[PDB]
Symmetry: C3
Subunit: 68 residues, 3 copies
Amino acid sequence: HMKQLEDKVEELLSKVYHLENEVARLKKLIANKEDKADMKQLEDKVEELLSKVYHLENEVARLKKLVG
Amino acid sequence: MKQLEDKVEELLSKVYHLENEVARLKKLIANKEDKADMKQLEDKVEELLSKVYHLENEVARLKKLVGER
Amino acid sequence: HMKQLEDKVEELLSKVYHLENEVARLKKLIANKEDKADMKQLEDKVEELLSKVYHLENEVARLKKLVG
């Protein structure tokens, strides 16, 4: 019985060792993923571009009328 | 001895839970945006900023030439 | 025999505590990373901008010629 329990503890130690290795790998993977906190600057640039392009399109339509 | 047994029982439970949790986290990580992909998106946007700046300058000049406010 | 088993149970308790803490931390870190599914609207805007800007460039070239 004592042997059997010691064997179970050894098996669990081995499982925990494997999980530690897996967690180490996941830490590396997550470090190469984009943070939500870094999204906003890009989002703002895109929103500004959309506004600027809308204005340009409106101006170009007006110029086409006048030139033609 | 039974105390030791009960301790291993509770540790066993914790380990099974951690196995499940780590499996779930592995899946969540796979669904996240890569920094490398973000960088390429940022590069496109930087090019767009330059092109739009130029267009704005060209359109301002055209407006002047046709007498448009 | 008993002393050895206790030392391994103690070892396992400590390693599990360590693993639990780092998994809890990883969970929160992962939650702060951007999901690919939440990128699609931004990606579509950038694609739309590429097209709109290319079109504007062609229109503006044509206007510059016609205006003189």
